[PDB]
Every structure is written in C-alpha cells, then in structure tokens.
Design a protein around this ligand. Sequence first.
Ligand SMILES: CN1CCC(COc2cnc(-c3cccc(Cn4nc(-c5cccc(C#N)c5)ccc4=O)c3)nc2)CC1
Length: 263
Amino acid sequence: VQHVVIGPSSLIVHFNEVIGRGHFGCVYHGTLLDNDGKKIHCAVKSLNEVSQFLTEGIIMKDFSHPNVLSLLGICLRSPLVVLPYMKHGDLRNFIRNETHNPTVKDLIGFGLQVAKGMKYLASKKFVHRDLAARNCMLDEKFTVKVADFGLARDMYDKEYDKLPVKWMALESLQTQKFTTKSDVWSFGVLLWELMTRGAPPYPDVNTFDITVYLLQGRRLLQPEYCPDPLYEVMLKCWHPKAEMRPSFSELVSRISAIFSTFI
Ligand SMILES: CN1CCC(COc2cnc(-c3cccc(Cn4nc(-c5cccc(C#N)c5)ccc4=O)c3)nc2)CC1
C-alpha cells in the first residue's frame, strides 16, 4: 500500500457529483494534482473487513494493460479508492445512450478490446467472475477498460440475485465454481449485449429460472445485426464443457479477423 498512498491534501473529492452508485459505496468525480500543478480527473470510490478488502484488491496495482482499469492510488484518512476518470462511463449505458451512434464495427471493436483486457487478466491467472458490459468503462478516446475488480469491485446495477446469474456459466450456476472458462461464458453474453446495444439478456426469464432454461437446450438468440461468425463465437463461449470453450487468446485472434472485414 506504501507506494500507492495518496495524501488527503492532494485529493479534491466532489461529494455533490455522484457518477456511480454501488453497494459498498459511491463513485464521485475527483481532482488529483500532479508534481507540475496540472489537474487530473478522478473517479473516487468510497468504501463503507476493510483491511481484508484492501488485501484482496491490492493486486490490481501490479496489473498494467490498455484494456484493463488501472489504480491511481488509495487515499487514507474510511479509505477512498482513486481511479482514472472514464469520460463515457460504463459500456452498457454508452451503447444504450442516444448522443453517440456506434456502428456494428465499433461494437465489435468494443468486444475485441474487452477480449484483449481479459486475455491479459487470464495470463495473470486472474478470474473476473462478473464480466458484463455494465462492468467495463470507456475513456475519452473510446478505449474500453475491463473494470469492477480488486479495489473497484462492487455491484453497480440491479442485475444480481447476490450473483449475476444471467452472465454465469452453467457449471458456476450449479456448483458455484468460477474459472477463466466461466469468464469466457460471460464474455459471450457481453458480445450479445454489444450486438443488441444493451438489451437485457433473457428478458422474459426470471433470474431464479436461468439454470433450468439453459438445461432445456436454450441459448440467447442471434441479434439482427450480429454477423454469423460472431454468433458462432458466442455459441462456442457457451459450450456446455468448460474446457471446450475458446481461450481469450483465441477470441482476440478470431474477433480481430471479423473486425477487419468491416469498412
Ligand atoms: C451522464 N454521465 C455523467 C458522468 C460521466 C462519467 O462517469 C463516470 C462514472 N464512473 C467512473 C469510474 C471510473 C473508474 C472506475 C469506476 C468504478 N466502476 N464503476 C462502474 C460503474 C459506474 C457507474 C455506473 C455503472 C453501471 N451500470 C457502473 C463499473 C465498473 C467500475 O469499476 C468508475 N468514471 C466516470 C459519464 C456520463
């Protein structure tokens, strides 16, 4: 924690500007100062046991990838988690917004960015457990950051019942076993959210019903603007046998090929 401590004098937290709400606390717009006096935009996560949470999440300072959320630091005083501000907020609200019009290629490009971030996390043997479009952020350059892990972990939406059962693999619903292969299943649902522009998966299925539903021989339907090879990728992500699901390295390779076919 020593190398990532932020002095309370160097942090301005705007408690009036709430930009996110979670069960553990709120996200606020903040301001950090650099050695030269330049203001850096923050997202300050509040935390309301605490030592255990910081112990579990301090591994995030060692992660560094352009598609993975980084940690700016921790302000000790209840501790505050300092994260980089993500101008366009969460990926799900972005694709449901009406100020921007992402093309089918842009949506596939967002999925490819997530797959690159996940490929990095899987190479570090890190299992996300809650991969979903609501849990990825978009910065000022429209770069996707896989977020909601370590110190940033929280439930930021009401899509839990708490577990995100509609994004969970069949073996995780049955035995509560989470692996990189169950993150590949969640990644499939995330591609489907991207291709439907943020539609809720299985809308007429109650969260308690999902296991029986999947076991009947059912999967999410192909969205109307989803290319066939991308729907095949989603179907491979949802393979009933975890070991038969593509790796994130294979997903990056395959999705980059599909992305390249669009003008
Ligand atoms: C209209 N609105 C005004 C504010 C604008 C900027 O808002 C921002 C909101 N949040 C951050 C931020 C950055 C780094 C880390 C986190 C923590 N974190 N939060 C979420 C999160 C936040 C809000 C809603 C939902 C959901 N569902 C999910 C997911 C994963 C995660 O790790 C938050 N930055 C900017 C966007 C447009």
